[PDB]
Amino acid sequence: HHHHHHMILCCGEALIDMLPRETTGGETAFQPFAGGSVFNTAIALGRLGVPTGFFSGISSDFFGDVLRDTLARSNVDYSFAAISNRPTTLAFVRLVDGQARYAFYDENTAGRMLSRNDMPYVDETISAMLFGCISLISEPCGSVYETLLAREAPNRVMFLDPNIRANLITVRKTHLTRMKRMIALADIVKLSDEDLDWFGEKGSHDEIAAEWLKLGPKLVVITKGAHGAVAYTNHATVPVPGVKVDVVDTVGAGDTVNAGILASLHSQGLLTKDALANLSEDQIHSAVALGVRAAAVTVSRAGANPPWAHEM
Amino acid sequence: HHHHHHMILCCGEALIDMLPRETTGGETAFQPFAGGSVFNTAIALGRLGVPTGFFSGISSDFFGDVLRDTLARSNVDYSFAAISNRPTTLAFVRLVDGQARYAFYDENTAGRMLSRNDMPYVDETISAMLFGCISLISEPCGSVYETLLAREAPNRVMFLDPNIRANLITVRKTHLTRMKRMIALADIVKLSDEDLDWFGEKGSHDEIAAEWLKLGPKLVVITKGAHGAVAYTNHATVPVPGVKVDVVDTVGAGDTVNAGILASLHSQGLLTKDALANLSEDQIHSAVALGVRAAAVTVSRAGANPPWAHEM
Numbered sequence: 001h002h003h004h005h006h007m008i009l010c011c012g013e014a015l016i017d018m019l020p021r022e023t024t025g026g027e028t029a030f031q032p033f034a035g036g037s038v039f040n041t042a043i044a045l046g047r048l049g050v051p052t053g054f055f056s057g058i059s060s061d062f063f064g065d066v067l068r069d070t071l072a073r074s075n076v077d078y079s080f081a082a083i084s085n086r087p088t089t090l091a092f093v094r095l096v097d098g099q100a101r102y103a104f105y106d107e108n109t110a111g112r113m114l115s116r117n118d119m120p121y122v123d124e125t126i127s128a129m130l131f132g133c134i135s136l137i138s139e140p141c142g143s144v145y146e147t148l149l150a151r152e153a154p155n156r157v158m159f160l161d162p163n164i165r166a167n168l169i170t171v172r173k174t175h176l177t178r179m180k181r182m183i184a185l186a187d188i189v190k191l192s193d194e195d196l197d198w199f200g201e202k203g204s205h206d207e208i209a210a211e212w213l214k215l216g217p218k219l220v221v222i223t224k225g226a227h228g229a230v231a232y233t234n235h236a237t238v239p240v241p242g243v244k245v246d247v248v249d250t251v252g253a254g255d256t257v258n259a260g261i262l263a264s265l266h267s268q269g270l271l272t273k274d275a276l277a278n279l280s281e282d283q284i285h286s287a288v289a290l291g292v293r294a295a296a297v298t299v300s301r302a303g304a305n306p307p308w309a310h311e312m
Numbered sequence: 313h314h315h316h317h318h319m320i321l322c323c324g325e326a327l328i329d330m331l332p333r334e335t336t337g338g339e340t341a342f343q344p345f346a347g348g349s350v351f352n353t354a355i356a357l358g359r360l361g362v363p364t365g366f367f368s369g370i371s372s373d374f375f376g377d378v379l380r381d382t383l384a385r386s387n388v389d390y391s392f393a394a395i396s397n398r399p400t401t402l403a404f405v406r407l408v409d410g411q412a413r414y415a416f417y418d419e420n421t422a423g424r425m426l427s428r429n430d431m432p433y434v435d436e437t438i439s440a441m442l443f444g445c446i447s448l449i450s451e452p453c454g455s456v457y458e459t460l461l462a463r464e465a466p467n468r469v470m471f472l473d474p475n476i477r478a479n480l481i482t483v484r485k486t487h488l489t490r491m492k493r494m495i496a497l498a499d500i501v502k503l504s505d506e507d508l509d510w511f512g513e514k515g516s517h518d519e520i521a522a523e524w525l526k527l528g529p530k531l532v533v534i535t536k537g538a539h540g541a542v543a544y545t546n547h548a549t550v551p552v553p554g555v556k557v558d559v560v561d562t563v564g565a566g567d568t569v570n571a572g573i574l575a576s577l578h579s580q581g582l583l584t585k586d587a588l589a590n591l592s593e594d595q596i597h598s599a600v601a602l603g604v605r606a607a608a609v610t611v612s613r614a615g616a617n618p619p620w621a622h623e624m
């Protein structure tokens with residue numbers, strides 16, 4: 001086993017986004033792009049210069065090759081991932097009558113059919129783990145990821161990004177109970193206002209954050225689009241304004257906020273459970289502001305294309 | 313139940329071929345094309361003006377819509393098909409170092425997961441049925457198609473197009489025994505020289521055709537690329553020369569030969585088991601020559617794009 005040098009290990013989906021493009025012959029085709037929210041977060045972390053790892057199910061096929069190539073060039077260690085001959089998850093996007101239509105091809109895929117046997121070896125040189133998004137909806141991988149979070153939560157820092165995609169949730173009740181169990185096990189929870197709306201809880205979003213801070217998390221961050229983010233602890237509330245940019249699109253911007261927060265806490269030497277329980281206003285602001293600043297670069301260009309440290 | 317007016321019912325795969333194209337931005341994308349060998353044969357039959365039906369598994373999703381739209385515009389009756397919410401089979405093609413690479417995404421698809429419950433209602437107004445190609449390799453659909461052939465063989469004319477795709481055959485022995493059982497139940501068998509090579513039998517291809525004419529078929533046709541085809545019965549051997557054309561590609565050309573043969577036999581009023589056992593040299597030549605002439609149009613343009621009668 002290799003020393004992972006105080007690594008942040010991202011655990012979750014890697015997929016191919018299949019997006020509509022125009023061919024030379026004036027016909028619609030689908031151009032493949034490496035993607036998946038947790039994948040994007042891992043890419044963003046690597047580009048910020050943090051020691052970064054990725055655990056997922058990845059195919060041996062040519063789409064799997066795309067994913068691995070992208071991870072490698074962003075310096076992400078994906079030795080943790082389970083490789084199999086199952087196909088790669090494909091996410092088709094179309095514009096139909098000025099409205100977005102989605103088709104999710106995830107049958108018996110490398111990513112979906114993870115088993116307990118596939119769980120990574122995690123020693124003291126992993127400082128933190130991140131979970132989130134659609135890898136937690138699907139089965140059997142969702143149960144594997146929840147099990148991994150529950151197994152490792154006592155040992156190191158846990159970050160959860162609910163990142164709700166309701167169109168893929170077939171039974172609300174069952175995903176909601178999983179979210180609550182996983183929030184209870186998280187040290188840091190980051191989500192958008194829209195994410196939070198899906199939980200259907202009472203009161204202002206500030207009030208709900210305060211309630212969640214009684215359930216396990218030491219830090220709750222609510223992202224607010226162009227408006228930045230607000231961070232909540234039991235000792236402080238820290239509003240962080242957005243950065244003004246010329247917007248191309250905002251897809252995957254939240255994935256970069258995850259990276260900025262974790263990268264800053266890493267740099268500050270605050271990635272321990274105990275350190276997180278004692279964050280100062282300055283330490284919180286620094287971490288969420290890096291997430292917000294980094295995410296602003298992403299929204300300034302097409303797709304989830306997170307910033308290199310040297311781009312900032 | 314509707315009168316199908318002496319219909320030829322094609323039974324087999326419908327899929328999306330995903331082919332490499334250049335985007336305006338100089339990037340590779342995959343353009344979707346309606347396809348599948350048995351689908352192509354049904355399209356070709358419809359375009360030749362023959363009453364034509366199609367039994368398959370087809371998705372309710374947007375790729376399924378492409379398939380249905382294509383069938384409708386070629387006047388094919390697909391009321392027989394089983395519609396489900398399972399995804400559509402995707403066949404990816406790439407050019408890697410001047411060599412063709414294939415990736416077949418067929419997990420839990422509309423086409424693959426057919427059951428006995430899905431088999432069509434077949435009455436006296438169906439004159440013939442056609443089977444073939446990769447729908448016979450996969451399970452469970454392959455068993456369903458073989459069962460349908462065995463059930464209907466005593467009642468009407470059976471056409472088999474082995475159309476071998478060895479890259480998708482995982483166990484040779486099991487597909488070979490299925491081919492032999494289905495050949496035994498066929499009135500007409502058409503295949504290429506390369507198809508025949510895969511059977512690994514002894515002697516000249518003329519000798520092997522003669523052996524198969526002792527096993528059930530009344531007509532065996534071997535296609536020979538630019539060289540046309542040779543047709544074999546117990547009463548005659550009929551060489552049919554190829555038509556010279558400017559070749560674009562030959563993909564799916566064999567599917568049009570199927571259509572031409574069946575369309576001619578339909579027009580001549582020879583689509584009964586008894587009529588096929590008594591074919592004259594002239595009747596054989598007419599049918600195979602239409603297949604060869606029609607296929608020549610297909611090879612004159614990109615992909616499996618079979619000719620309308622009014623194009624000939």
Ligand SMILES: Nc1ncnc2c1ncn2[C@@H]1O[C@H](COP(=O)(O)OP(=O)(O)NP(=O)(O)O)[C@@H](O)[C@H]1O
Nearest residue numbers: 192223224225226228250251252253254255292295
């Ligand atoms: N219009 C904008 N202008 C500047 N920054 C933006 C804009 N929209 C989003 N951002 C940045 O991106 C962060 C996250 O965006 P936000 O819309 O809250 O996440 P999200 O809805 O979860 N996006 P996604 O990753 O696609 O799920 C914000 O906190 C900002 O820092």
Ligand SMILES: Nc1ncnc2c1ncn2[C@@H]1O[C@H](COP(=O)(O)OP(=O)(O)NP(=O)(O)O)[C@@H](O)[C@H]1O
Nearest residue numbers: 504535536537538540562563564565566567604607
């Ligand atoms: N180079 C050519 N020139 C003219 N006609 C051709 C040419 N190639 C094929 N054809 C026609 O297409 C028929 C079938 O082609 P052939 O190559 O024998 O089938 P195949 O190998 O089974 N093709 P496919 O449908 O892709 O499996 C031939 O009998 C010809 O009538």
Ligand SMILES: [Mg+2]
Nearest residue numbers: 192224225250
């Ligand atoms: Mg948003």
Ligand SMILES: [Mg+2]
Nearest residue numbers: 504536537562
């Ligand atoms: Mg050929």
